[PDB]
A paper describes a structure:
Glucuronyl esterases (GEs)4 are enzymes able to cleave ester linkages connecting lignin to glucuronoxylan in the plant cell wall. GEs belong to the α/β-hydrolase superfamily and possess a catalytic triad common with serine-type hydrolases. [name] is an interesting member of CE15 and the α/β-hydrolase superfamily in that it features acidic residues at both the canonical and noncanonical positions (Glu-290 and Asp-356). Here, we have investigated by mutagenesis the residues involved in catalysis and carbohydrate binding in the enzyme [name] and, furthermore, present a series of structures of [name] with different ligands, including monosaccharides and, for the first time in CE15, di- and oligosaccharides.
One of the xylobiose molecules is found in the active site of the enzyme with a xylose moiety binding analogously to GlcA and XUX, except for the lack of the C5 carboxylate and the xylobiose being β-linked instead of the α-linked GlcA in XUX. Indeed, kinetic characterization revealed that xylose inhibits the BnzGlcA esterase reaction with a Ki of 48.1 mm. The xylobiose is modeled such that it packs with the nonreducing end projecting into the cleft and the reducing end projecting away from the protein. The sugar makes only a few interactions with the protein, with only hydrogen bonds between the main-chain amino of Ala-223 and O2 of the nonreducing xylose residue and between the main-chain carbonyl of Ser-218 and O3 of reducing xylose residue. This loop region in other [name] structures (residues 220–227) has large B-factors likely resulting from considerable movement of the loop. However, in the presence of xylobiose, the B-factors of this region are reduced significantly. However, an alternative hypothesis could be that the protein can interact with xylan chains not only in the active site but possibly also in other surface-binding sites similar to those found in other CAZymes.
Author numbering: 31 to 432
Write the structure that this text describes.
Amino acid sequence: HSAYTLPDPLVGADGTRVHDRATWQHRRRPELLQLFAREVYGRTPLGRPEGMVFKVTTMEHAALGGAATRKEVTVRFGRDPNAPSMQLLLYVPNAVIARAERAPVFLGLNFYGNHTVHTDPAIALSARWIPAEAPNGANHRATEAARGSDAQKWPVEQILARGYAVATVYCGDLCPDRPDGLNASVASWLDAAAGDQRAPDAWGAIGVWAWGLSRALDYLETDPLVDASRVAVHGHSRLGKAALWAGAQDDRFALVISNESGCGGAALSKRIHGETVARINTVFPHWFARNFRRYDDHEEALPVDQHELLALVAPRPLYVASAEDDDWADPRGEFLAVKAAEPVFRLFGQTGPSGEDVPRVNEPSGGALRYHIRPGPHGMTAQDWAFYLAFADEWLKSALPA
Ligand SMILES: O[C@@H]1[C@@H](O)[C@H](O[C@@H]2CO[C@@H](O)[C@H](O)[C@H]2O)OC[C@H]1O
Ligand SMILES: O[C@@H]1[C@@H](O)[C@H](O[C@@H]2CO[C@@H](O)[C@H](O)[C@H]2O)OC[C@H]1O
Ligand SMILES: [Mg+2]
């Protein structure tokens, strides 16, 4: 649509313009984080819980034909062996380990279980609930036929060959992706209420998923094989909504990738196009705060829009990408959010897409703030990853000190 106006990221709530990087970082950034927490995603009640324990359950030094070390880590959210946990899978390129250099990392959540990212028969088969839409499941549990069922979204061998570790966690370890899933999620025990319905500003699945990414980063900071200052957080679609909210809240993430995150991710909500606030909240009432429902059919009242979420990543490199046929995500709305975030990146001396309108397919545009659109439907393809790997080579924090 063409009948909206956006709030200016560089004007504070009180009307005073943001003229320097220090004002952005110390005043405007907290102001915008609070607006998103209260009105959109809900409040993250705390970060790392006390007594988080990391247990390496398996470590294989000759995975993928010798190309990788594969570690499985249980990240347990409390010292009691009964405490809730999540299962992290890490592949690290053996070429980099052998050189005794710490590897940079791509970290993102997976849709249907760690065993779906690669056929590798040694990955632990998740025993947690999975959605009916997961390929090759039965009775909401994974089967052996589900191994590698999502490998098309995870070019592990290529990422490793280019020098990067691959870390992942099943989103459903943190919040099962079902409308009732919060009652079996992190939110059900982390600073939980004594009873009754969740409060208007209480976080939902996207907040919980984002929090899990930050807990994975807490683990990576302890692993001698990796450089936890060089972690690119990425996600596809609903898990890209989570990646953006994680990268915005947690400035330790060195680079952020939104692959087709759409509504409530990179796409402008005020631009009424494809999925709308009412449709996302109606179909997925667990994803956002209950407060976000106030904007159902009333996006004009939103005090922020998603360009300000993208701006919260600055000055760190941010990639937003779309698919040409993916109308529901609103590709032009994703691009326009990038353009409306660009002035903040520019304040930090970075540059964004330089063209007038959505670029031609498979021609990325921008510096540390980058956009591309590829042909085809919603998905995450080898072409997307080729562009992300080039971006990481150029813009991920270097291993060398300043
Ligand atoms: O944020 C919400 C939590 O406050 C909620 O916590 C539940 C409250 O009722 C108690 O009987 C339960 O033990 C407790 O888990 O869980 C859902 C979450 O959305
Ligand atoms: O926010 C987006 C969701 O609205 C979208 O939901 C899909 C719409 O197509 C249906 O056929 C699917 O069942 C449903 O998953 O998923 C992508 C997400 O970004
Ligand atoms: Mg939309």
